Amino acid sequence: EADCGLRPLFEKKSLEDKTERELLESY
Amino acid sequence: IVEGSDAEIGMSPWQVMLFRKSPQELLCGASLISDRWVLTAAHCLLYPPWDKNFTENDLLVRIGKHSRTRYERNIEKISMLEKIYIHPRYNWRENLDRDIALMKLKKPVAFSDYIHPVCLPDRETAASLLQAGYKGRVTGWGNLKETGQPSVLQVVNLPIVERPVCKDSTRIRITDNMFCAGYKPDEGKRGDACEGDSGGPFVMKSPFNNRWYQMGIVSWGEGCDRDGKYGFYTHVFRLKKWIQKVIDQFGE
Amino acid sequence: DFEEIPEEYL
Ligand SMILES: Cn1c(Cc2ccc(C(=N)N)cc2)nc2cc(NS(=O)(=O)c3ccccc3)ccc21
């Protein structure tokens, strides 16, 4: 899917959810 | 989910609820990967030990939900199943090896702010993200305790564990088509999937293209959030070949 | 405790 993995209420409007940074920091 | 927290609205637009018609009940978790294909665990449909062998007509797929028990009017979309596909080498006899299955919806579902497909990883994405320590996210309306029912979709971030550790934690034969995640006893933090979350998605957000990828499927676990135990998940990429065939074969 | 869903889907 070309649009896969991009959330309408988050990535699509450049808003991040409350805990995704925890994920990024683990990488 | 044990030790998680309420999901934010639209936080997991690909979360799918496997719902049993009679009696109406939560059957399992699952994921939307396109407008007509839903991914889930094979045992959610087939598992003789527990007298489970559902057919298309016994199931219903609920997409775009937040609330567990309530019918979310104007938000969720209920789909009927056209055909179920279970991996040909799914080992339900021994260790649930290749615990994966596909469900083709009768009609495509309309995407929205609350409904949106997740990506399936490619070799490279899997290679660089599926490492010990790297955290993934697991969601579901499953139980909050090993032994309790959530009102809202739950979510928890969990670290992938070194294969040796996974194996040394159980007597069950672990395979490359599986990986385990969770906090070690000394790490302090905790959390895990639980009954009802099964079939659900283990996702990771690529730091390379900022997209969400489903690396695993909630497969099995001994109890829920027990010290020394870890949740095990189906390795999506290692089975993507099968996924491709199904879709590039019977796929509309 | 699952709210009734539109019987149309049934
Ligand atoms: C579908 N399923 C599940 C679902 C499941 C998945 C995850 C979790 C969890 N992370 N706490 C808890 C439960 N648990 C099982 C536990 C068993 N018992 S087992 O651990 O002995 C086993 C493992 C693998 C193959 C056969 C039997 C069998 C099936 C199971």
- What secondary structure does DSSP assign to B68-122, as a single string? SSS--TTT-EEEEEEEEEE-TT-BTTTT-BT--EEEEESSPPPP-SS--PPBPP-
Span from the CA of B54 to the centroid of ligand 1 (angstroms): 18
Span from the CA of B32 to the centroid of ligand 1 (angstroms): 23
- Asked if the C-beta of B8 comes within 8 angstroms of chain A's C-beta atoms, the answer is yes
Task: Examine the domain organization and report whether B135 and B153 are in the same domain.
Answer: yes
Instruction: Name the experimental technique.
Output: X-ray
* Chain C partners within 8 Å of B68 (Cβ): 2
Task: Examine the domain organization and report whether B245 and B191 are in the same domain.
Answer: no
Closest approach atom of ligand 1 to CA B99: 1
Q: How far is CA B71 from CA B10, B161, C9, in A?
A: 16, 37, 12
Q: How far apart are the CA of B62 and the nearest CA of chain C, in angstroms?
A: 11
Residue with tokens 């055909």: B83
Span from the CA of B195 to the centroid of ligand 1 (angstroms): 9
- Tell me which residue of B240, B75, B13 sits closest to A3, measured CA to CA: B13
Chain pair B-C, CB pairs under 8 angstroms: 22
Contact B201, B217 (CB under 8 A): yes
User: Among A11, A18, A22, whose Cβ lies nearest the Cβ of B135?
Assistant: A22
Task: Examine the domain organization and report whether B187 and B215 are in the same domain.
Answer: yes
Task: Examine the domain organization and report whether B60 and B87 are in the same domain.
Answer: yes
Closest approach atom of ligand 1 to CA B96: 25
Give the single-character DSSP code of C2: P
* Chain A partners within 8 Å of B206 (Cβ): 5
Task: Examine the domain organization and report whether B18 and B72 are in the same domain.
Answer: yes
At B61, the amino acid letter reads V
Sheet containing strand B135-140, strands side by side? B5-6, B154-159, B135-140, B201-205, B212-220, B231-235, B178-181
**Measured between alpha carbons, how far is B152 from B168 in angstroms, rounded to an integer?**
34
Task: Examine the domain organization and report whether B231 and B135 are in the same domain.
Answer: yes
**Measured between alpha carbons, how far is B129 from B151 in angstroms, rounded to an integer?**
32
Task: Examine the domain organization and report whether B139 and B195 are in the same domain.
Answer: yes
User: Among C1, C4, C5, whose Cβ lies nearest the Cβ of B78?
Assistant: C5
The catalytic site residues of B sit at: 43, 99, 198
Q: Residue A26: which CATH number?
A: 4.10.140.10
Strands B231-235 and B178-181: antiparallel
The structural domain count of chain B equals 2
Q: How far apart are the CA of B47 and the nearest CA of chain A, in angstroms?
A: 30
Residue of chain C with shortest Cα separation from B19: C2
Identify the domain containing residue A20 by its residue range.
1-27
Which residue numbers in chain A precede an interruption (C–N > 2.5 Å)?
Answer: none
- Residue B152's CB is within 10 A of a number of other CB atoms, namely 16
Task: Examine the domain organization and report whether B18 and B107 are in the same domain.
Answer: yes
**Which strand (E) or helix (H) includes residue B156?**
strand B154-159
* Chain A partners within 8 Å of B236 (Cβ): none
- Determine the 3-state secondary structure of B157 from DSSP: strand
Q: Residue B33: which CATH number?
A: 2.40.10.10
Name the percent of chain A in helix, strand, coil, to the closest 5: 35, 0, 65
Task: Examine the domain organization and report whether B83 and B124 are in the same domain.
Answer: no
- Which chains contact C through at least 3 pairs of Cβ atoms less than 8 Å apart? B
> What is the phi/psi pair of residue B23, to 5°?
-85, 150
Task: Examine the domain organization and report whether B128 and B211 are in the same domain.
Answer: yes
Chains A and C touch (3+ CB pairs under 8 A): no
Residue of chain C with shortest Cα separation from B57: C10
Task: Examine the domain organization and report whether B137 and B21 are in the same domain.
Answer: no
The structural domain count of chain A equals 1
- Helix (H), strand (E) counts: chain B: 3, 15
Identify the domain containing residue B21 by its residue range.
13-117+238-250
